[PDB]
Amino acid sequence: SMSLNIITVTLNMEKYNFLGISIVGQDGGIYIGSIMKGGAVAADGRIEPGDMLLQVNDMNFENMSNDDAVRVLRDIVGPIVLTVAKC
């Protein structure tokens, strides 16, 4: 079968300074507020504004404070595997 609303997106940051997304926290509680020009995410094209960020390289964002999720994502930015939920 095919995963419909949970999708895996691989990004290679060797070519990009930044992800080019604004991440907001409101669990599914972290999501994409905007996608910016010139970043790894826009280049890939699969992630959309409003998608929820579930996982980055087997780190799950649930039970994570806001500072903690930034520090984690910061350190990670090898290939980056993002798991996002469309709904």
Numbering used by the authors: 260 to 285, 291 to 341, 345 to 354
What does the paper say about this structure?
Additionally, the apo structure of human Dvl2PDZ shows conformational dynamics different from its IPM peptide bound state, suggesting an induced fit mechanism for the Dvl2PDZ-peptide interaction. This conformational variation is more prominent in the structures of human Dvl2PDZ, bound with different peptides. Interestingly, Sector 1 of apo Dvl2PDZ is composed of residues residing in β2 and α2 regions of the domain, whereas Sector 1 of Dvl2PDZ internal peptide (WGEFpep, WGEFpepQ8A and N3pep) complexes had residues from the β2 strand, β1–β2 and β2–β3 loops. Additionally, variations in Sector 1 composition highlight peptide-dependent conformational adaptation of Dvl2PDZ domain. In contrast to the earlier study by Munz et al., we observe that the α2 helix of the apo Dvl2PDZ structure has limited conformational flexibility rather than having the ability to explore all possible conformational space, specific to the ligand-bound forms. Thus, our structural and MD simulation studies suggest that Dvl2PDZ adopts peptide-dependent conformational change due to its intrinsic flexibility.
The PDZ domain of Dishevelled2 (Dvl2PDZ) binds and activates WGEF by releasing it from its autoinhibitory state. Using biochemical and molecular dynamics studies, we show that a unique “internal-PDZ binding motif” (IPM) of WGEF mediates the WGEF-Dvl2PDZ interaction to activate the GEF.
